[PDB]
Ligand binder design. Structure first.
Ligand SMILES: Nc1ncnc2c1ncn2[C@@H]1O[C@H](COP(=O)(O)CP(=O)(O)OP(=O)(O)O)[C@@H](O)[C@H]1O
Ligand SMILES: [Mg+2]
Ligand SMILES: [Zn+2]
Ligand SMILES: [Zn+2]
Ligand SMILES: [Zn+2]
Lengths: 84, 171, 557, 178, 97, 112, 107, 269
DNA sequence: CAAGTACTTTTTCCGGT
RNA sequence: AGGA
DNA sequence: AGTACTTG
């Protein structure tokens, strides 16, 4: 159905699985010569660049957290706490 | 006829395009793929309306390749001809078999037999014409046709038409 | 590799199970399938317009498919068909067919009970098709008469007509592939003593099922769109293509046909006899003969291992491989080829312990690293490095095996006349050797643990064994009395992350199985750590300085 | 990949009925009267008379030329050449269909000005005729109520002959003297 | 080597969704079939070159999709069909929940 | 509920008899699974494998062909929600890494 | 409620669903000697109001299928006289959390 | 079978444990909503000993000249004497501790104190002690309000379930119960001052780290807890192979099979 | 009706009759 | 027939 | 070595 931003009840924290999937996706993208939203401070590994993008919180992705009924909450990698 | 229709193409963007000029490359890929297109289901997709308000939505990243898939929701001018539709057009082709009529994006071919009997072919004219006691149907001439049936054919739609009944024929 | 197709890519969301209507089989079919002969255009080696390819899939590997012009690796097979002379039971459905007959009128095709019986409308209520059919059967099996009129939903004095036909129902019993019933009869109130004993034909059960009401069969587990009862009886048979039953073609002049290809020809032969036998001089019994043989072949094709003992044995005594046999557990399609699979980018050797390896690394023998490849994309960040590994080639350690182009076509650096001058372009892929620090999945079978498969850092080393840190020994349950282990190389930037970010050895240290560390100091190090730490134990400067320099993180203090 | 619509039918296994399309106002599944805009709301069928459609496309490409030049920052015989120029500027060129269409509409339109197409759209959308008939009445020039009731046979019982003749008379006045 | 049933479990246990996919697809079996959107079967006569598609028996020349499945699953489905069962594959839902 | 209590107690005792320690939650979950149906659902082909999960999922243990035959007869619909169904289909299973979706937001992309 | 010593004739048993909307319950005296609800292993079951169930399902985004089930013949479902569809809230002590709330729908 | 029976079970984004049919198995994973690796055996002090020993450990009476906190324990010690308003707070505190103690004895019938719970409090305090160089001689700069209310606030922040409704909120309260019994027991006023000797600075740090640790300790929606449970029972069973009642592998076999005709049926009266 | 019967999943992954 |  | 099933 798609749950509104006010009314979102899932964790404000990013899941171990979310973080891994984001780093993977961005590494795969950077590696496919996608634009990088961070200064590569001499960086060359797309995974190492992905960590830097997630650290500077400059990853233009969104996690769609599906619920067992089918509904979902959308969360920006920007808004997700990284205590991981 | 000539309708305005709400349609939605799915586009698949390669990661190297995830720059700020994204919505722009997308809106264009839609226009490349969709405008000029001819489908049986919707007819000729002619002109994509309201460029400024084309809906890109959030695009899902497909797991193994980094590409993202977007459902580009849009609105366009279409042309889906029907049997029984009365159309006006200009003649183009003309032979012993009949004459073809250009109607917007599509041609309609009128059979020698789908015309009144009085109209006879004339090979010895420039360009080859169809002659009646009153009328002379030829290349640049304007004609009102009734579409008898159409054939959905790849990048086009073609139809067989009549000028035999009342109020049809030369204009 | 498969070629570009303009068809939209999508994923399977639902699997809609069902049965084939004969009409569908005929419709989907690319040919029927008249001659049991496989090919030889009268000895002339080329496929026949009769069995395997009267427009089906392709053989030869040379020479493309007729109907899709694709050829071998692209062409899924194409189905054909065999219009059976007489109907036959599907081996699988035999008991459901029986149970349905036991529930319905063997004459009018109406349910033996209805909305009028209390227990029946009670059973009809059940939402679960499987559980409701179970209930319907147990009530209806008993009812041995189709009722014309029954007591009304108010009083027994006035009885309402439910639906016609009075006929006594047979007491059906199976005699392996045949349904034979026993009608109680009536004769002067008595009979039975001695009831009517006659076998129920496929064709009669078909006609009763054909007459079962949509509402009626739908009250049984059935579905008017995907699975009608009549479809449990086979009329027109789908002939699977070569990809399903490939000919293991030894030499150039030798067939090597599949078991399925032979059993199909048996069916054809059994069918042809029956057809001519009835069309021609019909010696009445000689037909029920050839019919029962056709039933047998169509039975043993789908399932050879039937209760009713006679196994269809190949001329050699060895029995025929049924289709059911192909799908049966551990080894065979499901558990054998789908749940588990043999895989590329995998290596296996003897393991040995190394105190000089870090907990999270794995000693990878050079030879293994020079075989296992990772497909790296040509990017500006790596362009120069990759250009050098390609230059190095397949036999230098930091080297490459292939260069994959934009074109999709694979360059072999082992033979390509251009293996030297190979100018790399962004977006190409270089299949480079496995290198120090690449994450790899390490595993020791059994594999009863989350920790029996952990990700390690490559460490290319000499000698032919995989080297592992000693503390990592416990989660794997490994020892070095000759144990071997498996290595798996991820081919994606995405899968590599999964491994480093989730299954890495250090992540696995504390285990949820018992909420405590699953790795610790073991053997030599445990034995020596006690000895080193006694009150009695003092060390002189000379050694103290070496004991220090050895800690790679020592403050220099 | 090809285009899809707002109609969400689930033809599960059951293929057909492929019903014919006519002057029984029996158009496709797609060109049905009860349509649905992407906002989900039920909206009615939009059929355009040549004159109306000529303006729509012209308008669209005009504003597309605006957006293109914005993103590049950091007399019927004459209307024909004017249009052929705008097409070089906005459309992919490869679209021979649009050039052919615009030439056709430019040469076949009855109502040249926006205000003219306005009054046509008002006068007609009061009859209660299905947007297809309302378009054909606007795009085919008719004199007898018979001429119209013949070429648009669906009209047959829908309007009065005299009422249709009043309407045909107003449309004839509205014809922009090219 | 065999990435077996048990090994599949450890992968499921880790939550390595893509790594499991990769082992079972790209690193083994993986194949491309064309399926009909009306009867969810591999019926399609994909003459991918002349860009012709077709599913005679549905007369469908439009509603066709390409899917990526293990060749052994292509096999399983053809085997299930030879035995009269229909494993119809659909790229959209109809049940919700 | 006392069934769950007894069942757990007994399970725990087999584990603790060896001297081993398995954290509550693992045994709790097994016991909870056998329970939820309202009775004592055994961990056998004729027990759990006869529940209403996916036809393909169920055929992947013990009754294979027999299960699939029944699916075709009763026109069963596989949800494709189970792990095993995606494993068969060569699809990214809704497990860990696949339990949610990933999308590009154009707004944030043009913001950076 | 009808508390009987040894048996109830199948003649008399046919008159139990005879008077709806009113309801009847049979009970063997021998079973009633000990109150099972008093046992160590027996947690607090609580019958929910039609509005409470409505909320439980809304709050957990459930269909009635999805909840754990209690059999209509369960000693505790008998003690409380649970009817088909009626939901029980079970409150057990936890070595994990100290207090754990489960739910069971009636069969 | 254990694997095949539990394969499709995982923790969803509503902290709920469900199968491939979305049926609820457990309302919250392991009844507490905690990831197993983040748990450690911890002694619940409150649980045992004499009612007398408890009183000495937890009781603070600012209205009694003998049972106040000596002005050596904290700075306010002098001015805290006979303060009736504060004494209300310590009475709430004490009565809550006694409630806990009775409840714990209901759960752990045999008085077993050692239970695995998340957040090792003993370490946080130990670490605060070296981090801040705690002087076991000097008086603390803590208020009775600073401790009593401080603990009371942290409790509202140990979040497992997030929903804005009574149903979900009670689930949260319930799931967090036992942990808070430990929290209140290890963080009582008398204890913090007399035993730990913390400063306001150190106490604030202890409090933030409990919060932080607790949040890190919750299960991650995605966890295939079914397979994990199967393997976590299965693996040990393989390692036990590779009144004298049937036990080990064969009794486990008896169990999973729900075997009717069991080998050694026995009643304990 | 019961006894005694067949099947079945009956641990995993790695030279050649 | 062998291997952990 | 067990379980529903099957056949006497
Ligand atoms: N049939 C089998 N199937 C699966 N794993 C097996 C197996 N046989 C042996 N193993 C594995 O190999 C390990 C070693 O067994 P053995 O080679 O006999 C030496 P050990 O019994 O462990 O005693 P030791 O360490 O004091 O010498 C086992 O613990 C087990 O994991
Ligand atoms: Mg060994
Ligand atoms: Zn082919
Ligand atoms: Zn009858
Ligand atoms: Zn089809």
């Amino acid at each position: 159905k798609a749950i509104p931003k006010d009314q979102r009840a899932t964790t404000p924290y990013m899941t171990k699985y979310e973080r891994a999937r984001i780093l993977g996706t961005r590494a795969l993208q950077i590696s496919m010569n996608a634009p990088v939203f961070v200064d590569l401070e001499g960086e060359t590994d797309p995974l190492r660049i992905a960590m830097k993008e997630l650290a500077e919180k400059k990853i233009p992705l969104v996690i769609r957290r599906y619920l067992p009924d089918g509904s979902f909450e959308d969360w920006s990698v920007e808004e997700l706490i990284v205590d991981l | 006829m000539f309708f305005i229709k709400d349609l939605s193409l799915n586009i698949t963007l390669h990661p190297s395009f995830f720059g700020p000029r994204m919505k722009q490359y997308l809106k264009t890929k839609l226009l490349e793929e969709v405008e000029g297109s001819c489908t049986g289901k919707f007819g000729y997709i002619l002109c994509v309306l309201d460029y400024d308000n084309i809906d890109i939505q959030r695009g899902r990243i497909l797991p193994t390749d980094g590409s993202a898939e977007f459902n580009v929701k849009y609105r366009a001018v279409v042309f889906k001809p029907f049997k029984g539709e009365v159309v006006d057009g200009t003649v183009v082709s003309c032979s012993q078999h009949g004459f073809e009529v250009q109607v917007g994006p599509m041609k309609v071919f009128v059979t020698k037999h789908l015309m009144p009997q009085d109209l006879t072919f004339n090979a010895g004219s420039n360009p080859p014409s169809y002659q009646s006691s009153e009328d002379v149907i030829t290349i640049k001439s304007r004609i009102r046709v009734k579409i008898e049936g159409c054939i959905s054919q790849v990048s086009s739609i073609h139809a067989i038409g009549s000028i035999k009944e009342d109020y049809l024929g030369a204009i | 590799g498969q070629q570009y197709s303009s068809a939209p890519l999508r994923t399977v969301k639902e699997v809609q199970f069902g049965l084939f209507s004969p009409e569908e089989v005929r419709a989907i079919s690319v040919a029927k399938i008249r001659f049991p002969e496989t090919m030889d255009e009268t000895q002339t080696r080329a496929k026949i317009g009769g069995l395997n390819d009267p427009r089906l899939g392709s053989i030869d590997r040379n020479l493309k498919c007729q109907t899709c012009q694709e050829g071998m690796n692209e062409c899924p097979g194409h189905f054909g068909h065999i219009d059976l002379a007489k109907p036959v039971f599907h081996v699988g459905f035999i008991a459901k067919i029986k149970k349905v007959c036991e529930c319905v009128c063997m004459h009018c095709g109406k349910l033996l009970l209805d909305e009028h019986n209390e227990l029946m409308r009670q059973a009809l209520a059940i939402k679960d098709s499987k559980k409701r059919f179970a209930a319907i059967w147990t009530l209806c099996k008993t009812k041995m008469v189709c009722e014309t009129d029954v007591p009304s939903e108010d009083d027994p004095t006035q009885l309402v007509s439910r639906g016609g036909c009075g006929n006594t129902q047979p007491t059906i019993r199976k005699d392996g592939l045949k349904l034979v019933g026993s009608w109680k009869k009536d004769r002067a109130t008595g009979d039975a003593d001695e009831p009517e004993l006659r076998v129920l034909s496929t064709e009669e059960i078909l006609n009763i099922f054909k007459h079962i009401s949509v509402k009626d069969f739908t009250s049984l587990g059935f579905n008017e769109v995907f699975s009608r009862p009549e479809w449990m009886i086979l009329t027109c048979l789908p002939v699977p293509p070569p990809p399903v039953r490939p000919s293991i073609s030894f030499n150039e002049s030798q067939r090597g046909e599949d078991d399925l290809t032979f059993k199909l020809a048996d069916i054809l032969k059994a069918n042809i006899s029956l057809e001519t036998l009835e069309h021609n001089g019909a010696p009445h019994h000689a037909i029920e003969e050839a019919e029962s043989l056709l039933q047998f072949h169509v039975a043993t094709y789908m399932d050879n291992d039937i209760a009713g003992q006679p196994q269809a044995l190949q001329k050699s005594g060895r029995p025929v491989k049924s289709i059911r046999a192909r799908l049966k557990g551990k080894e065979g399609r499901i558990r054998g080829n789908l749940m588990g699979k043999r895989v590329d980018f995998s290596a296996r050797t003897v393991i040995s312990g190394d105190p000089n390896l870090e907990l999270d690394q794995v000693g990878v023998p050079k030879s293994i690293a020079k075989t296992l490849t990772y497909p790296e994309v040509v990017t500006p960040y790596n362009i120069d490095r990759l250009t050098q590994l390609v230059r190095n080639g397949p036999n230098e350690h930091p080297g490459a095996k292939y260069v994959i182009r934009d074109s999709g076509d694979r360059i072999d650096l082992r033979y390509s006349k251009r293996a030297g001058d190979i100018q790399l372009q962004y977006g190409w892929k270089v299949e480079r050797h496995i290198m120090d620090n690449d994450p790899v999945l390490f595993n020791r079978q059994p594999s009863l643990h989350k920790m029996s498969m952990m990700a390690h850092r490559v460490k290319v080393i000499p000698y032919s064994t995989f080297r592992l840190n000693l503390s990592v020994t416990s989660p794997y349950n490994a020892d070095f009395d000759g144990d071997e282990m498996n290595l798996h190389v991820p081919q994606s930037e995405e899968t590599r992350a999964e491994l480093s970010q989730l299954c890495a050895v250090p992540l696995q240290i504390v285990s949820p199985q018992s909420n405590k560390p699953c790795m610790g100091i073991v053997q030599d190090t445990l034995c020596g750590i006690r000895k080193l730490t006694l009150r009695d134990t003092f060390i002189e400067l000379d050694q103290v300085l070496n004991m220090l320099y050895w800690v790679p993180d020592w403050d220099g203090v | 990949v090809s285009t899809s619509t707002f109609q969400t039918r689930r033809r599960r296994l059951k293929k057909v009925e492929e019903e014919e399309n006519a002057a029984t106002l029996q158009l496709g599944q797609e060109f049905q009267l009860k349509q649905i805009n992407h906002q989900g709301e039920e909206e009615e069928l939009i059929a355009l008379n040549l004159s109306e459609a000529r303006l729509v496309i012209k308008e669209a490409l005009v504003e597309r030329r605006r957006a293109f030049k914005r993103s590049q920052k950091k007399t019927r015989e004459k209307e024909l050449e004017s249009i052929d120029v705008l097409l070089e500027q906005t459309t992919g060129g490869n679209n021979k269909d649009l050039k052919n269409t615009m030439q056709y509409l430019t040469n076949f339109s009855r109502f040249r000005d926006q205000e003219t197409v306005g009054a046509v759209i008002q006068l007609l959308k009061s009859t209660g005729l299905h947007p297809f008939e309302v378009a054909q009445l606007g795009s085919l020039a008719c004199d007898t109520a018979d001429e119209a009731k013949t070429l648009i046979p669906s009209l047959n019982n829908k309007i009065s002959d005299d009422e249709l003749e009043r309407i045909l008379k107003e449309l004839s006045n509205l014809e922009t003297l090219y | 080597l065999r990435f077996g049933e048990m090994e599949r479990d450890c992968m499921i246990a880790h939550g390595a969704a893509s790594f499991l996919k990769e082992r079972l697809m790209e690193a083994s079996d993986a194949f491309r079939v064309h399926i009909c959107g009306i009867c969810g079967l591999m019926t399609v006569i994909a003459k991918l070159n002349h860009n012709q598609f077709e599913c005679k028996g549905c007369d469908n020349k439009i509603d066709i999709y390409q899917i990526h499945i293990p060749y052994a699953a292509k096999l399983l489905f053809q085997e299930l069909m030879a035995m009269n069962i229909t494993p119809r594959l659909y790229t959209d839902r109809s049940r919700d929940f | 509920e006392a069934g769950r209590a007894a069942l757990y107690k007994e399970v725990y005792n087999v584990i603790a008899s060896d001297g081993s320690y398995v954290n509550y939650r693992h045994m709790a979950l097994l016991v909870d699974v056998m329970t939820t149906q309202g009775g004592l659902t055994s961990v056998t082909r004729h027990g759990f494998n006869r529940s209403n999960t996916g036809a393909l999922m169920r055929c992947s243990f013990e009754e294979t062909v027999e299960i699939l035959f029944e699916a075709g007869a009763s026109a069963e619909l596989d949800d494709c929600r189970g792990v095993s169904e995606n494993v068969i289909l060569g699809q990214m299973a809704p497990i860990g890494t696949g339990a949610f979706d990933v999308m590009i937001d154009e707004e944030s992309l043009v913001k950076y | 409620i009808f508390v009987y010593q040894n048996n109830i004739t199948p003649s008399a048993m046919k008159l139990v669903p005879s008077i709806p909307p009113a309801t009847i319950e049979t009970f063997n005296e021998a079973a009633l000697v000990v109150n099972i609800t008093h046992h160590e292993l027996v947690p607090k079951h609580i019958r929910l109001s039609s509005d409470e169930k409505r909320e439980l399902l809304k709050r957990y985004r459930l269909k009635e299928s999805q909840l754990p089930r209690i059999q209509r013949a369960d000693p505790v479902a008998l003690y409380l006289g649970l009817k088909r569809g009626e939901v029980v809230k079970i409150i057990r002590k936890s070595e994990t959390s100290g207090r754990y709330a489960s739910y069971r729908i009636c069969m | 079978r254990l694997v095949k029976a539990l394969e499709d079970i995982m923790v969803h984004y509503d902290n709920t444990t469900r199968n491939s049919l979305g049926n609820v198995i457990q309302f919250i994973y392991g009844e507490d909503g905690m990831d197993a690796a983040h748990i450690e055996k911890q002694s619940l002090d409150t649980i045992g000993g004499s009612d007398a020993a408890f009183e000495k450990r937890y009781r603070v009476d600012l209205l009694n000249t003998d049972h106040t906190l000596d002005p050596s324990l904290l700075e306010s010690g002098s001015e805290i004497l006979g303060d009736l308003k504060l004494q209300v707070l310590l009475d709430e505190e004490y009565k809550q501790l006694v409630k806990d103690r009775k409840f714990l004895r209901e759960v752990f019938v045999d008085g077993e104190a050692n239970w695995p719970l998340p957040v090792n409090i003993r370490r946080i305090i130990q670490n605060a002690q070296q981090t801040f160089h705690i002087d076991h001689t000097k008086p603390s700069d803590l208020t009775i309000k600073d401790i009593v209310l401080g603990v009371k606030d942290l409790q509202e922040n140990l979040l497992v379930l997030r929903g804005k409704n009574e149903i979900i909120q009670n689930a949260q309260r319930d799931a967090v119960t036992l942990f808070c019994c430990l929290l209140r027991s290890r963080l009582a006023t008398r204890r913090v001052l007399q035993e730990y000797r913390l400063t306001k600075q150190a106490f604030d740090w202890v409090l933030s780290n409990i919060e932080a640790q607790f949040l890190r300790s919750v299960v991650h929606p995605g966890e295939m807890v079914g397979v994990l449970a199967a393997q976590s029972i299965g693996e040990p069973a393989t390692q036990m192979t590779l009144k004298k009642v049937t036990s080990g592998v064969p009794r486990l076999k008896e169990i999973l099979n729900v075997a009717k005709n069991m080998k050694t049926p026995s009643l304990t009266v």
